[PDB]
Structure 1
Amino acid sequence: SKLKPFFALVRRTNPSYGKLAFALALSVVTTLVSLLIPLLTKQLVDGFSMSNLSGTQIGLIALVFFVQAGLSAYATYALNYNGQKIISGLRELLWKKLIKLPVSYFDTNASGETVSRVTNDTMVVKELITTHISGFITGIISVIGSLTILFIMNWKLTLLVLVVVPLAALILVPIGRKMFSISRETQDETARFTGLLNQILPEIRLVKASNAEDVEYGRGKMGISSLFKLGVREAKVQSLVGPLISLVLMAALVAVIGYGGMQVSSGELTAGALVAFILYLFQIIMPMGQITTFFTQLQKSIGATERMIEILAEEEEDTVTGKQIENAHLPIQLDRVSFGYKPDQLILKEVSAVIEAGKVTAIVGPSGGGKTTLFKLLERFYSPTAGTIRLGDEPVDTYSLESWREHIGYVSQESPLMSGTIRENICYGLERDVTDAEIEKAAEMAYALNFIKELPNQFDTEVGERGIMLSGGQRQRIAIARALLRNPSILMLDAATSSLDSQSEKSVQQALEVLMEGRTTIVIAHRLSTVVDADQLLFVEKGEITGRGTHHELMASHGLYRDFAEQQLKMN
């Protein structure tokens, strides 16, 4: 039942069954050859009289060993290659999913956790498919075959002693758990002492000033004493684990092998049987670790598969709504919009507003209100539930989301880099129009070519994977150049305007004011520099729009009491 999701996940990469089955069967054959090797050893050792004729047995054993090595090598290569192909397919599906369907809010939930889950679960699935399932089949077959062959070879006497010895595990394993518990307690006490010292030492100034340093010494003494006491207890428990373990193991060892020697000396049908017995004991003991590791890795992998299938279950639409974009220039209306992240909370309540076309609109919001929710809302990163964000006659649910996103230019505050080269930063505006070779010319129009006129290069200019050698002012100029290049129709801005000061702000204002003199813009930042360039201003408070009209007189009057109190809170 629980293996059905894992089988389906493997089935997503369909052409991966025949070669896996062949590899597993070949591994089984290799295990059987390994089982057969000690019988050849016994036959050789019983052919004692003719050393020269024992050369034939030596050659046969060498040939069998080489055949086993070759078969195991081919099976391992097939298993690993098929597992790598399965992992490539799984990662391909996961990356196709995460980038495309997961909506912005899903990525806001957890960014690093998503990547950690993807990588760790893919690695765990690889480890399960390539090694642990084949390892478990190999171990089970080897153990069963070895026990059967020992039963056939020795009558019962040595083998029942061997199977009784596992009682040594019943005597040893629980004591190891007590050892582990004591060691963990010691580690905890050491961590506590380290924390105490890491607290005391940085405050050394206060101690030395207070002239109470010796008192701290006394406190430190106590800590040391504590650890010493615990150490003593560990020592005592060690004196119960150190010898005893060895004793039991050695005793068990002797018993088994001792009986073998007994059966050799008593004339019982054992000799080469004893040699084969020791080899079979090795081949029995070794795969138990593989079996236990598989049993634990299955428990890890079922949860890994649950996480992966949780990732793969998300959904989204891009052009499913329709395709009805023709002009995308018409006044934008908010009509009774009331929706946030979850319908229960209702973080937005009946938000309505009117904005003209080709008209500059500013948004002023508080530190903790609904400015961020609205900012994401006029980007449609959230799906409307009750209200209507209507461009014209509610076509926003009618045409494609990609079509609108193509007609809008976004820069909020940082928008740092898409790592690579500036060629990537200007080629993100390649919507099948490839922009021919005018990009640099556009950089000249966007006041970016003259700024970049130093030219370390144009295509080999690397910002680096980290992207730290270029400051903010240049990168927002590049972002605005990209926005102008792409599709200067509608711009929504959170004002990249920061601590750049006069030169950068004036340059961006001249670039923008010239560019959108006939195009619609929205501004949502805090400062009052864009609002004077904004012919219409709004205000967000408690998840509600409160304020409409022009800037000067209205925010001279509307902002007299409550917005002024909010400001006085802001600088304070």
Structure 2
Amino acid sequence: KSKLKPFFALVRRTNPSYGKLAFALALSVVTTLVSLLIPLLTKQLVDGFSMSNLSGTQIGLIALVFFVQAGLSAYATYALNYNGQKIISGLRELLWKKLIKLPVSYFDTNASGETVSRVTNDTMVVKELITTHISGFITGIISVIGSLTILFIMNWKLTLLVLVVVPLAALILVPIGRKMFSISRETQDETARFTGLLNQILPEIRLVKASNAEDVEYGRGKMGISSLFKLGVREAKVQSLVGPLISLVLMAALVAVIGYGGMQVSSGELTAGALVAFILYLFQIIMPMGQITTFFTQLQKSIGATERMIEILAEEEEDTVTGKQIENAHLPIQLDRVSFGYKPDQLILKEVSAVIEAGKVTAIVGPSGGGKTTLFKLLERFYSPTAGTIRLGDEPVDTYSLESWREHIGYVSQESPLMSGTIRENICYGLERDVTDAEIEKAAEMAYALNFIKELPNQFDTEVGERGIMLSGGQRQRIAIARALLRNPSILMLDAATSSLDSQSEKSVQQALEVLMEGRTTIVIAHRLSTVVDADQLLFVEKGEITGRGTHHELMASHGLYRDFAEQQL
């Protein structure tokens, strides 16, 4: 198809300073036309010089005019820069919104460091293109058109050769444009890859120091840098080659013009003098043509980078389109025939079916890799079930809206994450309703976290750093549990919520959680049968299917392998 149309559509979507840029373009056009026409009337210049020699109060007029011209040029440049900055800001805003609203599968498949490099660097390159080269192209086009009209006025014939030159120049230029576009895309991709590699390596700085692999990572960084340098060198080579081709085409055009004028001297013989003038005017043609061609090259390079952006700007996203609010929050969750494969081929969950009854703690247990966490991901509708559907009292879950189903659910991850900022911010993360201070204190007390959080500068200091490195594993897990409890949901999912907690801390947190969420549904995933001994409905999962489904004693009698786990613990 085409690329200019999508690129200009994106720029329009950015909502730029359309009128302001148009006004700046008009200012630049008028000033350039006046400045081009002024030198032509040299007789006016000489008579003005004589008048200034005669007239006394003429310095002020010229000085004011020059100051006004300088101010107009400065304001035009400022307007162009402002418009470019607004365009890049709009691009960044749109890209950030789309990225943050994409489904989890896209991020699972394409990582996140490449996307961030995409946004930042593509926006930067578009900014570089927008500001100066557009002004260069406009001035060049105006100057070329004016000079072409002047040359036509001087002669109606010789301009035919320039009109022949234009297609020749375009034909010479096209391959350069294609090569520049390819190089720009390859660069703006390798830069993203390198940034992603660095980002994933940095915490493996503790990781590497644990090992002895500083040299290997330095070598990987050097290889990425070398690839980027090679791409830059190739782009520079193409940009350099751009010029000499234009010079050669213009020289050939002038040679053809002179050859034809050799015969034209038959009628316009003395017109050779005018011919000389033509040559001079032709040299003027040669200033802005370069400018114009330069713009084209840039107009390709930007496209390259921007191309990737467009791909991100059309995925699809999930929101509360449906609007069907839960409004009940107390129903049994019935899992029908359901099956999941992250790739379309393989299946992790194979024909699962059960009933999480409200008011009881259903515990999913089994060997590692059986498919426990993916069950929670389905239950929170991170992905969409393929085989069947999940209902909440004879109502398909898809009927309800994401913003309502997720609000009524608390979810502690098996890899309990914390984000940079205050502990209070992490506990309160995302909540729209104001928390005051009583709620945070209650949540911390019910998560057995207040004991240490008050041994530090409170619950507004002790920046958790990146990935929660500035806190212990037990503290991190307890902060995650505190966040989940503070959310105050009807459905509470806790997958391996006490993995890294001591026996006493585990007992206290379990007692508090049972007392709180006793009158609400709770789904716990525990590798230790001790915590789930006092369960209500075990859902032993093995290789993506609930082989055993019953209470402690009944499931122990039925399964046979569950006995192996319990007896091994015993």
Could you state the TM-score of these two structures normalised by the residue count of structure 1? 0.69
SS of alignment partner, residue 53 of structure 2: coil
* Distance verdict in 2 for CA 1:423–1:130, change over 3 Å: same
Q: Measured at CA, do residues 261 and 233 of structure 1 come closer, stay the same or move farther in structure 2, by a change above 3 Å?
A: same
Question: Per-residue deviation at 1:20?
Answer: 2.1
Q: Which moved more, 1:229-238 or 1:131-140?
A: 229-238
Cα distance change on mapping 1:271 and 1:120 into 2, 3 Å: farther
Contact 1:337 1:386 in 2 (8 A): yes
More divergent stretch after superposition (235-244 vs 32-41): 235-244
Contact 1:422 1:463 (C-alpha < 8 Å) held by counterparts: yes
Structure 2 CA distance for partners of 1:216 and 1:355, relative to 1, 3 Å? closer
Task: Identify if the C-alpha distance between structure 1 residues 553 and 17 changes in structure 2 by more than 3 Å, giving closer, same or farther.
Answer: same
SS of residue paired to 1:492: strand
Deviations 1:4-30 (A, max 9, x none): 333433333557432222111222223
Shift of 1:81: 1.7
Go from structure 1 to structure 2 and tell me whether the alpha carbon gap of 1:320 and 1:189 turns closer, same or farther (over 3 Å shift).
closer
User: Does the aligned pair in 2 maintain the 1:125–1:301 contact within 8 Å?
Assistant: yes
C-alpha contact 2:172 2:245 (8 A) present in aligned 1: no
Greater Cα shift, 466-475 or 44-53: 44-53
CA apart distance, 1:112: 1.8
Shift of 1:154: 12
The answer to whether the 8 Å contact 1:101/1:315 transfers is: yes
Distance 2:267 2:180 in 1: 42
Query: 1:334, 1:352 within 8 Å by CA — same for their partners in 2?
Result: yes
Structure 1 stretch displaced more, 488-497 or 139-148: 139-148
CA distance in 2, matches of 1:378, 1:58: 82
SS in 2 for 1:523: strand
Find the counterpart in structure 1 of residue 357 from structure 2: 356
Post-superposition Cα deviations, 1:402-444, rounded to whole Å, max 9, x if no partner, equal 2221221111133332322223123336343645754334433
User: Once the two structures are superposed, what CA deviation does each residue of 1:325-371 show, in whole Å capped at 9, x if it has no partner?
Assistant: 23322332211113434656555432212232222233345555534
Displacement after TM superposition at 1:244 (Å): 16
RMSD over aligned CA atoms reads: 8.9
CA distance in 1, matches of 2:16, 2:206: 69
CA pair 209-187 structure 1, distance change in 2 beyond 3 A: same
Q: Distance in 2 between matches of 1:518 and 1:208?
A: 48
What corresponds to 2:89 in structure 1? 88
Q: Offset of 1:475 from its aligned partner?
A: 2.2
The structure having more radius of gyration, on CA atoms, is 1
1:128-147 deviation per Cα after TM superposition (whole angstroms, max 9, x unaligned): 44333332222233345456
Q: Quote the residue 1:126 is aligned against.
A: 127
Cα distance change of structure 1 residues 456 and 490 upon mapping to structure 2, 3 Å threshold: same
Taking a change above 3 Å as real, the CA distance of residues 42 and 370 of structure 1, as seen in their structure-2 partners, is farther
CA distances 1:168-205 after superposition (whole Å, capped 9, x unpaired)? 99999999999999999999999999999999999999
Q: Any idea what SS the aligned residue of 1:55 has?
A: coil
Deviations 1:262-300 (A, max 9, x none): 999999999999999999899766655643442233223
Describe the SS at the equivalent of 1:354: strand
1:5·1:305 contact (CA, 8 Å) conserved in 2?
A: no
Alpha-carbon distance between aligned partners in 2 of 1:274 and 1:484, rounded to the nearest angstrom:
89
Is the CA contact (8 Å cut-off) linking 2:447 and 2:509 kept in structure 1?
no
After alignment, is 443-452 or 269-278 more displaced?
A: 269-278
Comparing 125-134 and 557-566, the one that deviates more:
557-566
Asked if the contact 1:493/1:523 (under 8 Å) is kept, the reply is: yes
Q: CA distance change for structure 1 residues 238 and 409 in 2, over 3 Å: closer, same or farther?
A: closer
C-alpha contact 2:366 2:527 (8 A) present in aligned 1: yes
Q: Is the 8 A contact 2:118 2:192 kept in 1?
A: no
Tell me by how many angstroms 1:76 deviates: 1.7
Residues 49 and 269 (structure 1), Cα distance of their counterparts in 2 relative to 1, 3 Å cut: farther
With 75-84 and 145-154 compared, the bigger mean Cα shift is at 145-154
Moved more, 249-258 or 485-494: 249-258
Deviations 1:545-567 (A, max 9, x none): 32212346745873549987999
Q: Is the 8 A contact 1:334 1:351 kept in 2?
A: yes
Give the length in aligned residue pairs. Answer: 569
Listed as ranges, the matches of 1:105-184 within 5 Å are 105-106=106-107, 108-146=109-147
Instruction: Report 1:268-417 matches (<5 A).
Output: 287=288, 290-341=291-342, 348-364=349-365, 368=369, 370-417=371-418
Distance 2:521 2:189 in 1: 63
1:299–1:440 CA distance, 2 compared to 1 (3 A): same
Deviation at 1:149, TM superposition (A): 5.8
**Which residue of structure 2 lines up, in the alignment, with residue 232 of structure 1?**
233
Whole-angstrom CA distance in 2 between matches of 1:24 and 1:246: 28
Task: Assess if the C-alpha contact under 8 Å between 1:406 and 1:487 holds in 2.
Answer: no
| Contact 2:413-2:496 at 8 Å conserved across structures | yes
- 1:492 positional shift: 0.9
Secondary structure of 2:171's partner? helix
Q: Relative to 1, partners in 2 of residues 1:50 and 1:247: Cα closer, same or farther, differing over 3 Å?
A: farther
Compared CA separation, residues 248 and 104, structure 1 to 2 (3 A): closer
Deviates more, 1:475-484 or 1:323-332: 323-332
Q: Is the deviation greater in 165-174 or in 197-206?
A: 197-206
Mapped partners of 2:196, 2:100: distance in 1: 42
Q: CA deviation at 1:79?
A: 2.0
Helix, strand or coil: the match of 2:501? Answer: coil
SS at match of 2:467: coil
Task: Report if the CA contact (8 A) 1:360-1:520 is conserved.
Answer: yes
1:216–1:120 CA distance, 2 compared to 1 (3 A): closer
Displacement of 1:448: 2.6
Instruction: State which drifts further: 475-484 or 525-534.
Output: 525-534
Contact kept in structure 1, 2:16 and 2:90, CA below 8 Å: no
Distance 1:292 1:480, change over 3 A: same
SS at match of 2:450: coil
Q: 1:422 to 1:277 in 2, by over 3 A?
A: farther
Q: SS of the counterpart of 2:320?
A: coil
Instruction: Report Cα offsets for 1:67-114 as digits up to 9, x if no partner.
Output: 443222222222222232233333333333332354455455331222
Task: Specify whether residues 399 and 237 from structure 1 end up closer, same or farther in structure 2 by C-alpha distance, changes over 3 A only.
Answer: closer
- Residue 35 of structure 2 is matched in structure 1 by 34
Structure 1: 5+ residue stretches without partners? none
Task: Kindly state the Cα deviation for residue 456 of structure 1 after the two structures are TM-superposed.
Answer: 0.9
Displacement after TM superposition at 1:510 (Å): 3.5
More deviation in 275-284 or 9-18? 275-284
Where 2:35 maps in the other structure, the secondary structure is: helix
CA contact (8 A) 2:319 2:403 kept: yes
The answer on whether the counterparts of 1:369 and 1:542 sit within 8 Å (CA) in structure 2 is: yes
Indicate conservation of the 8 Å contact 1:263/1:270, yes or no: no
**SS in structure 2 opposite 1:518?**
coil
Shift of 1:524: 3.2
Q: Distance in 1 between matches of 2:260 and 2:411?
A: 83
Distance 1:366 1:65, change over 3 A: farther
* Counterparts of 1:397 and 1:228, CA distance in 2: 50
Aligned residues of 2:423 and 2:464 also touching (Cα < 8 A): yes
Distance 1:199 1:250, change over 3 A: farther
| Structure 1, 383-392 or 247-256: larger mean CA deviation | 247-256
- The answer to whether the 8 A contact 2:364-2:541 is kept is yes
Q: Is the 8 A contact 1:423 1:459 kept in 2?
A: yes
Higher mean C-alpha deviation, range 116-125 or range 35-44: 35-44
